């Protein structure tokens, strides 16, 4: 499904600015907040609630009310350098431990 970009160089430079990302959404009806999405590096593709990160290229869909943009970014795209820059590895480990341990309690 395309490998995730793990370099310090964004895959989509045209979407590097917060403002550029914000425009891609338009009127947004979805449970997840467009400005929180833009902040977490995401821009809309115009395919329902599908977003992609400008940096890693990582795509995410089918946002539940309980699914946080930053947490999901870490969950599915842990190699993203934008994520590492913004949140730190301390945060990233926490999220990973949290989700890895969320699996324990469900089974
Ligand atoms: C459909 O999976 C579950 C949802 C649930 N809602 C959150 C926000 C995100 N979740 C992951 C996701 O959407 N994934 C993961 C992966 C890596 C399989 C992938 C690849 N491409 C695209 Cl477009 C999307 C996508
Ligand atoms: Zn990313």
Swiss-Prot record:
BIR repeats: 18-83
Location of the region described as Required for interaction with SEPTIN4 isoform ARTS in the Swiss-Prot/TrEMBL record: 15-30
Effect on the protein upon substituting residue 96 to A: No effect on interaction with SEPTIN4 isoform ARTS
Binding residue positions for Zn(2+): 53, 56, 73, 80
Coiled coil region boundaries: none
Tissue specificity: Expressed in colonic crypts (at protein level). Ubiquitous, except peripheral blood leukocytes.
Region (Required for interaction with DIABLO): 82-103
Location in chain, cross-link Glycyl lysine isopeptide (Lys-Gly) (interchain with G-Cter in ubiquitin): 75, 81
Signal peptide per UniProt: none
Processing after translation: S-Nitrosylation down-regulates its E3 ubiquitin-protein ligase activity. Autoubiquitinated. Ubiquitinated by TRIM32; leading to proteasomal degradation.
Compartments in which it is found: Cytoplasm; Nucleus
Subunit text: Monomer, and homodimer. Part of a complex composed of SEPTIN4 isoform ARTS, XIAP and BCL2, within the complex interacts with SEPTIN4 isoform ARTS and BCL2, SEPTIN4 isoform ARTS acts as a scaffold protein and stabilizes the complex. Interacts (via BIR3 domain) with DIABLO/SMAC; the interaction inhibits apoptotic suppressor activity. Interacts with HTRA2/PRSS25; the interaction inhibits apoptotic suppressor activity. Interacts with TAB1/MAP3K7IP1 and AIFM1. Interaction with DIABLO/SMAC hinders binding of TAB1/MAP3K7IP1 and AIFM1. Interacts with TCF25 and COMMD1.
Disease note: Lymphoproliferative syndrome, X-linked, 2: A rare immunodeficiency characterized by extreme susceptibility to infection with Epstein-Barr virus (EBV). Symptoms include severe or fatal mononucleosis, acquired hypogammaglobulinemia, pancytopenia and malignant lymphoma.
Stated role: Multi-functional protein which regulates not only caspases and apoptosis, but also modulates inflammatory signaling and immunity, copper homeostasis, mitogenic kinase signaling, cell proliferation, as well as cell invasion and metastasis. Acts as a direct caspase inhibitor. Directly bind to the active site pocket of CASP3 and CASP7 and obstructs substrate entry. Inactivates CASP9 by keeping it in a monomeric, inactive state.
Free-text note on domains in this protein's UniProt record: The first BIR domain is involved in interaction with TAB1/MAP3K7IP1 and is important for dimerization. The second BIR domain is sufficient to inhibit CASP3 and CASP7, while the third BIR is involved in CASP9 inhibition. The interactions with DIABLO/SMAC and HTRA2/PRSS25 are mediated by the second and third BIR domains.
Family recorded in the similarity comment: Belongs to the IAP family.
Record-given protein name: E3 ubiquitin-protein ligase XIAP
The species this protein was found in: Homo sapiens
């Amino acid at each position: 499904m395309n490998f995730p970009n793990s370099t310090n160089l964004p895959r989509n430079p045209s979407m590097a600015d917060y403002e550029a990302r914000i425009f891609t959404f338009g009127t947004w009806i979805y449970s997840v907040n467009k400005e929180q999405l833009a902040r977490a590096g995401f821009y809309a593709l115009g395919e329902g609630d599908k977003v992609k990160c400008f940096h890693c290229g990582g795509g995410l869909t089918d946002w539940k009310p309980s699914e946080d943009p930053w947490e999901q970014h870490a969950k599915w795209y842990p190699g993203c350098k934008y994520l590492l820059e913004q949140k730190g590895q301390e945060y990233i480990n926490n999220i990973h431990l949290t989700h890895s341990l969320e699996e324990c309690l469900v089974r």
